């Protein structure tokens, strides 16, 4: 009737509820598979996770499980089930069950031209999700096409909250070239200059990047290393204004910008000659150099580009806003307890 099922030589032990395994790929670190859920009669995605040797992998797993279990939103991936051993001592892996999403925006962009209607709809859903996340005082901090899941009807769901943090603007300041975790091509200019990525404006930049990418099927700022990323940004936006430089008090950061040759803005309509003009107006506002001047999520939603979808009453906000590895394991154990046969 059952056993410890294997997939590509590794235990993928999810039964008896989940049968007929097919492999998909790799996760952050751990195997991903689809499987037939025998209770709700649908195929699902199951991600195997093995974090307990390392406090960082515990921190990200716990952080993401805590977040995804607290969140309930149509445009954020839910956790349907969590499979693990009944005791801390026997728990070496955890399996997270999610709705099966056929594709993601990375894969889609590599293979499919998007109509303006698709771009508009996808951007609406990204921002609708992001409204909820930000309303919970959470920063996602790693928005990118591969973290935007899509099913067969183009329902879009934000995933991968492993690098998320509670917002903390009063402690956002840092020095020049401070090391950063999140994906390079979607990093706001200030990450390289004077920001730890603790304000909401960090996510809007990433959304701006994703919009630009949907318009042309190519990343807009494909930097090859930490500081090339900034010079990609400045080659399009042009040199920051005196006013925007006066906001950067750090001398290494400011003097770096002052050392560069003057660059003029590349107009959006020459970079994207087939783009809708309202899309380019909103792109410009999301890809603003100065984070204090950058559009906020709610303002983005209310922009004329999204007028066909905008409905604030149907764009919900969160009811409930918000260490050694041994204690993180116990907290992962406690956090996943609600899915245990009971």
Curated annotation (Swiss-Prot):
User: Keywords in UniProt for this one?
Assistant: Acetylation, Apoptosis, ATP-binding, Cell cycle, Cell junction, Cytoplasm, Cytoskeleton, Disease variant, DNA-binding, Host-virus interaction, Kinase, Membrane, Nucleotide-binding, Nucleus, Phosphoprotein, Repressor, Serine/threonine-protein kinase, Transcription, Transcription regulation, Transferase, Ubl conjugation
The domain comment in this protein's record states: The TXY motif contains the threonine and tyrosine residues whose phosphorylation activates the MAP kinases.
Q: What is this protein called?
A: Mitogen-activated protein kinase 1
Describe PTMs of this protein: Phosphorylated upon KIT and FLT3 signaling. Dually phosphorylated on Thr-178 and Tyr-180, which activates the enzyme. Undergoes regulatory phosphorylation on additional residues such as Ser-239 and Ser-241 in the kinase insert domain (KID) These phosphorylations, which are probably mediated by more than one kinase, are important for binding of MAPK1/ERK2 to importin-7 (IPO7) and its nuclear translocation. In addition, autophosphorylation of Thr-183 was shown to affect the subcellular localization of MAPK1/ERK2 as well. Ligand-activated ALK induces tyrosine phosphorylation.
What interactions and quaternary structure are annotated? Binds both upstream activators and downstream substrates in multimolecular complexes. This interaction inhibits its tyrosine-kinase activity. Interacts with ADAM15, ARHGEF2, ARRB2, DAPK1 (via death domain), HSF4, IER3, IPO7, NISCH, SGK1, and isoform 1 of NEK2. Interacts (via phosphorylated form) with TPR (via C-terminal region and phosphorylated form); the interaction requires dimerization of MAPK1/ERK2 and increases following EGF stimulation. Interacts with MAP2K1. Interacts with DUSP6.
InterPro entries reported in the protein's UniProt record: Kinase-like_dom_sf, MAP_kinase, MAP_kinase_CS, MAPK_ERK1/2, Prot_kinase_dom, Protein_kinase_ATP_BS, Ser/Thr_kinase_AS
Output the PANTHER family linked to this UniProt entry: MITOGEN-ACTIVATED PROTEIN KINASE
Give all Phosphothreonine modified positions.
178, 183
Variant or mutagenesis effect after changing residue 180 to A = Inhibits interaction with TPR
Gene Ontology MF terms: ATP binding; DNA binding; identical protein binding; MAP kinase activity; phosphatase binding; phosphotyrosine residue binding; protein serine kinase activity; protein serine/threonine kinase activity
Q: Which residues form the active site?
A: 142
User: CDD domains under this entry?
Assistant: STKc_ERK1_2_like
Q: Which SUPFAM superfamilies match?
A: Protein kinase-like (PK-like)
- Catalytic activity, reaction form: L-seryl-[protein] + ATP = O-phospho-L-seryl-[protein] + ADP + H(+); L-threonyl-[protein] + ATP = O-phospho-L-threonyl-[protein] + ADP + H(+)
The outcome of changing residue 167 to V is: In NS13; results in increased MAPK signaling; increased translocation to the nucleus; reduced interaction with DUSP6; no effect on interaction with MAP2K1
The consequence of residue 73 to Y is: In NS13; results in increased MAPK signaling; reduced interaction with DUSP6; no effect on interaction with MAP2K1
What activity regulation does UniProt give?
Phosphorylated by MAP2K1/MEK1 and MAP2K2/MEK2 on Thr-178 and Tyr-180 in response to external stimuli like insulin or NGF. Both phosphorylations are required for activity. This phosphorylation causes dramatic conformational changes, which enable full activation and interaction of MAPK1/ERK2 with its substrates. Phosphorylation on Ser-22 by SGK1 results in its activation by enhancing its interaction with MAP2K1/MEK1 and MAP2K2/MEK2. Dephosphorylated and inactivated by DUSP1, DUSP3, DUSP6 and DUSP9. Inactivated by pyrimidylpyrrole inhibitors.
Its cofactor is: Mg(2+)
Q: What is its EC number?
A: 2.7.11.24
Localization per record = Cytoplasm, Cytoskeleton, Spindle; Nucleus; Cytoplasm, Cytoskeleton, Microtubule organizing center, Centrosome; Cytoplasm
Family, per the entry?
A: Belongs to the protein kinase superfamily. CMGC Ser/Thr protein kinase family. MAP kinase subfamily.
Entry-linked PROSITE patterns: MAPK, PROTEIN_KINASE_ATP, PROTEIN_KINASE_DOM, PROTEIN_KINASE_ST
Task: Using the record's annotations, give every residue carrying the modification Phosphoserine.
Answer: 22, 239, 241, 277
